[PDB]
Design a protein around this ligand. Sequence first.
Ligand SMILES: [Ca+2]
Ligand SMILES: [Ca+2]
Ligand SMILES: [Ca+2]
Ligand SMILES: [Ca+2]
Ligand SMILES: [Ca+2]
Ligand SMILES: [Ca+2]
Ligand SMILES: [Ca+2]
Ligand SMILES: [Ca+2]
Ligand SMILES: [Ca+2]
Ligand SMILES: [Ca+2]
Lengths: 174, 676, 56
Amino acid sequence: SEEERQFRKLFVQLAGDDMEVSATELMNILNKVVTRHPDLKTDGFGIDTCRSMVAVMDSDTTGKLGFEEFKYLWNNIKKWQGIYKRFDTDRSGTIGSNELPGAFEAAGFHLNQHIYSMIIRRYSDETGNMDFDNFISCLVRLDAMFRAFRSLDKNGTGQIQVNIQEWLQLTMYS
Amino acid sequence: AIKYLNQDYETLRNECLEAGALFQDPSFPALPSSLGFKELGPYSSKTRGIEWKRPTEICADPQFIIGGATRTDICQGALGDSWLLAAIASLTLNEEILARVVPLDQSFQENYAGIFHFQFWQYGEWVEVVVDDRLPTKDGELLFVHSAEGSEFWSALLEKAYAKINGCYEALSGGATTEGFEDFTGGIAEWYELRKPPPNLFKIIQKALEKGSLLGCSIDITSASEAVTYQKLVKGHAYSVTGAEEVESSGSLQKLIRIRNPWGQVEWTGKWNDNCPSWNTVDPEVRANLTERQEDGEFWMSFSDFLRHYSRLEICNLTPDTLTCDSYKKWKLTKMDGNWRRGSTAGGCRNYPNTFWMNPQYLIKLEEEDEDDEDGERGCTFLVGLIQKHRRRQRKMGEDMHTIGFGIYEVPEELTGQTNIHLSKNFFLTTRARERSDTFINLREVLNRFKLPPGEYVLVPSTFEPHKNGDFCIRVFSEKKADYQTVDDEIEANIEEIEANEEDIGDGFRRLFAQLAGEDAEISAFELQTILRRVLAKREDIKSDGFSIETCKIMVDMLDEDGSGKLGLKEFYILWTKIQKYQKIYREIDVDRSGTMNSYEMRKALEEAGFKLPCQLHQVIVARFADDELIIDFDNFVRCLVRLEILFKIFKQLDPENTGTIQLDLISWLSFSVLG
Amino acid sequence: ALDDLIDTLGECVVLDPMDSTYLEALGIKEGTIPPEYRKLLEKNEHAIDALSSDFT
Ligand SMILES: [Ca+2]
Ligand SMILES: [Ca+2]
Ligand SMILES: [Ca+2]
Ligand SMILES: [Ca+2]
Ligand SMILES: [Ca+2]
Ligand SMILES: [Ca+2]
Ligand SMILES: [Ca+2]
Ligand SMILES: [Ca+2]
Ligand SMILES: [Ca+2]
Ligand SMILES: [Ca+2]
């Protein structure tokens, strides 16, 4: 009720003046924040990943992130940050192979070893270890498809059906 | 209907009796920029004293509708949106279409909260828009639009709903009535210069009105100097045609016509008006059923003075049918959007052959059985309607309606057998257009009716001058003979997954595989990346950001059928043939050698690659794989054709016999939608 | 060798006047705004470190 007013007050100063956050702007922001926190290893956020972050978070489909979109995104990044440092127990600045299941579960996510391995094949570096920008980029789309699924589990059965359209719409986003 | 800005009415109205009180609007601020920018900007003297008061606050009895939602409710406020307002006034003559736009059952007394809704036709879809009940008022009374009795509110909220879709109040400043009409109907706007009537113009008005079409008119303005004409007619000002009647006043049959002035005050003088004993000369029986005697901005006039005094007459019909014709027809609708963008697609019209050929092009199949011999001429009747999207929202920057128009070419009979059918620069230098828009005009939509022999035709939409930026969409209406239709094309792909075994593979590839793989024998993901960069720094064309590792991994985990980490021969041979063709297409489509895919090009590249997508979808691909200048570099291009060649592939096979549908549990839904 | 790979990617009068026209958008002149309502219009009654804050 209070922190929002003093938060919105400065979402603007970097929203530009089309009031919404661009993929380029979002990049610019993030890379500016990690360099001030050199204790989180990263090769930086590249344009292409900031595009999909904006894609999946953009939801009124104004192609860019307005306030309630930006806020939600940020709030998650901030949750996942603490989760990074916490479950990074060897202080490498990366979430390593064995640290991963710990954190994701902690991020509310519930997977099998099979899924974890492949995540680690697709999002981790050579050794099994996983960057910061990668870990974030990853959780953002887990979080997306998870809400999207939810948004259709009206039957509650943990089982949704979709058609060609819906399938493309919801997945032409990664 | 599509939900605007993806907000829902019934998920807002629910979320109050659980949340607390009366509802604001994140999507559409009630802050001092939901108003204007310049001429009504945040601090031009004009704007001050202005307050967002709800109906509850300035009115003991806040009603939504009272005494029907009729045309006396709509009365202009301090803004130049007569065009739209006149549109609303003539809307209320049809009850059951007003229905569509206005959900009449809303209240302040039922399960209420402050949110409201309206539906609008928007560039080809129906779109429902939600607003909060707060409105701009100064002193006691209302400022923008207002009712006859001052505690009726519907028409003022509608106005606010139409500003929301347009960014703000000030943006609604001026335009054509047909902009309004169509946004309420999705209808076909026929126009008429009142200098050059067609014969049964008067009988057209009557047909139209009967046919429940929409009607309005206006006297135009010439450079250099004052507004009001001395018969009391407002210059350059939208009026709404409402009544059509011919009745013998003692002596001769009289052509008479009822207009309404959106001010709701100031009716015309000198002739045939309201306080005029020319009404002595008419029979009371149909008279006391048709003429009143009060100032509401509404009046009659001879068709003669109407022809003499009014410049333009716009009409909106709810079908592509013409009113000059007297029988109803069948009609197919084909929709296609596009963009002009300076550098790539903003071409200008044919007056500029150095650029003309870089506008987008559009096929038009006029078909054998749809031929008729009606009206003397033998052909296929059709209608083209080119319309500028969202132009009113770039008014902040200053810009407005471009000057638009189109031309039609006959594709030569030797292209007839082809998909990749694009028309050359030199082609337009050797061939006159076969038909074309009336002119290029700075209207939001330009649409004419045509009749040509059955065949294939290219539609070329454009601005008059090149280098103008802007989005558009096109409605093509075909006349059809009722023995088809209800036929609806759908999202389909087209693999070419062949060439397994050594027989189909080559000894060159066989030998060259051995080279690149090196030690780990299969080609790694990091190995394919080195490869992609090499080609990237070899090929002069083919602009690229660079191929990321996250993408190469994806390429393996695509042709990695056996399962192992990396890519073996057959697995790699397929991968290469695929990159070979993604490249052939990119080349063949890149007709401006930018080394990149613009909007239009993408659409054509996808088609050449076997995909068949609706506009909604092309438009997502673009919005997702494209940079700010709306273009796709080669790497994004592959990433895009890969992802899609997967999504489809994963759909089929999870749905082998074509139940248009598929079903997924949570864990594996994640594992497709996020990986493998 | 890699060179050899990349090679596999594909070996190495009449004017027709279009006329334009210009139509004045309706009510863009203030003389068209109601008199009763023209009345009312006068009268009169650092960047990114607060984000860093969220990490540590
Ligand atoms: Ca911005
Ligand atoms: Ca947004
Ligand atoms: Ca670690
Ligand atoms: Ca990284
Ligand atoms: Ca009423
Ligand atoms: Ca009257
Ligand atoms: Ca290898
Ligand atoms: Ca790129
Ligand atoms: Ca393999
Ligand atoms: Ca190009």
